[PDB]
Design a protein around this ligand. Structure first.
Ligand SMILES: OC[C@H]1O[C@@H](O[C@H]2[C@H](O)[C@@H](O)[C@H](O[C@H]3[C@H](O)[C@@H](O)[C@H](O[C@H]4[C@H](O)[C@@H](O)[C@H](O[C@H]5[C@H](O)[C@@H](O)[C@H](O[C@H]6[C@H](O)[C@@H](O)[C@@H](O)O[C@@H]6CO)O[C@@H]5CO)O[C@@H]4CO)O[C@@H]3CO)O[C@@H]2CO)[C@H](O)[C@@H](O)[C@@H]1O
Ligand SMILES: [Co+2]
Length: 153
């Protein structure tokens, strides 16, 4: 048996929603520039992007992404069949991109990945380089595709 993780690059540079995903989000408008998904939540809506994998689910593992964000951002996953949600982490503000690699300890499969404006104050959120691994955060190695190019030596 192959014990290495499956890495799913959901998007690197975003110029729209990733192929294979719908947005079941709420209370926001999304724009795309400079390879970032830019979320502008509406004041008072506790808005979110909710990326819905149209075919299949993820299980456990970890989520990796670059984010900058004016306010706290709650990361959730959901199982749409059971309508069950799980808070992965709430991330504090940062005025520069930070790479996060977060364990997902939820014990149902998930088909929705949510980035939510936790304070409901309309703080903007920028996301790039979103990847799921079936392995742990401690075992996570960035996919070669995330490099600006890759010319193998
Ligand atoms: O169209 C495609 C598809 O749609 C299907 O229907 C989907 C729909 O598209 C989708 O949008 C919807 O998504 C749900 C999601 O499943 C829920 O988990 C989510 O729940 C939100 C909730 O809406 C928010 O109100 C709540 O907000 C919290 C906030 O997280 C928290 O930080 C805050 O606390 C405050 C507190 O209130 C203050 O007093 C003070 O203490 O400050 C704190 C912190 O600020 O409070 C907020 C308010 O309570 O967050 C939760 C969790 O994220 O809701 C969304 C939207 O409804 O899901 C449906 C499926 O059910 C169709 O079914 C399908 O046919 C169609 O094809
Ligand atoms: Co190589």
């Amino acid at each position: 048996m192959n014990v290495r993780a499956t890495y799913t690059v959901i998007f690197k540079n975003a110029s729209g929603l990733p192929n294979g995903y719908d947005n079941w989000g709420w209370g926001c408008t999304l724009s795309y520039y400079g390879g970032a998904m830019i979320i502008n939540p509406q004041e008072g809506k506790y808005g979110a992007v909710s990326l819905k994998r149209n075919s299949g689910s993820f299980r456990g593992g970890s989520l990796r992404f670059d984010m900058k964000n004016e306010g706290k951002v709650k990361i959730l996953v959901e199982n749409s069949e059971a309508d069950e949600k799980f808070e992965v982490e709430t991330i504090s503000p940062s005025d520069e991109y930070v790479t996060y690699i977060l364990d997902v300890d939820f014990d149902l499969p998930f088909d929705r990945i949510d980035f939510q404006d936790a304070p409901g104050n309309g703080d903007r959120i920028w996301i790039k380089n979103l990847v799921h691994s079936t392995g742990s955060a401690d075992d996570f190695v960035d996919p070669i595709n995330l490099e600006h190019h890759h010319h193998h030596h």
